[PDB]
C-alpha cells in the first residue's frame, strides 16, 4: 500500500493519460498542415 500511494500510481496514470491525449491531439492537428508539395523535387531533378 505504501508503494501504491507513495508513487500515486492512479494519479500518475491519469495525469500521463491526459498529457498524452493533449500531445497526440496537438501533433495530429499539426501534422496534417505540415505536409507540402514535391514540385521542388522535380525542379531540382530537371536542373541536375
From Swiss-Prot:
It is found in: Cytoplasm; Secreted; Lipid droplet. Transmembrane segments: none annotated. Palmitoylated; structural requirement for proper assembly of the hydrophobic core of the lipoprotein particle. Induction: Up-regulated in response to enterovirus 71 (EV71) infection (at protein level). It is linked to Hypobetalipoproteinemia, familial, 1: A disorder of lipid metabolism characterized by less than 5th percentile age- and sex-specific levels of low density lipoproteins, and dietary fat malabsorption. Clinical presentation may vary from no symptoms to severe gastrointestinal and neurological dysfunction similar to abetalipoproteinemia. Hypercholesterolemia, familial, 2: A form of hypercholesterolemia, a disorder of lipoprotein metabolism characterized by elevated serum low-density lipoprotein (LDL) cholesterol levels, which result in excess deposition of cholesterol in tissues and leads to xanthelasma, xanthomas, accelerated atherosclerosis and increased risk of premature coronary heart disease. FHCL2 inheritance is autosomal dominant. Interacts with PCSK9. Interacts with MTTP. Interacts with AUP1. Interacts with CIDEB. Apolipoprotein B is a major protein constituent of chylomicrons (apo B-48), LDL (apo B-100) and VLDL (apo B-100). Apo B-100 functions as a recognition signal for the cellular binding and internalization of LDL particles by the apoB/E receptor. This is Apolipoprotein B-100. It comes from Homo sapiens. The lineage of its organism: Eukaryota, Metazoa, Chordata, Craniata, Vertebrata. The chain holds residues 2451 to 2498 of 4563 of the full protein.
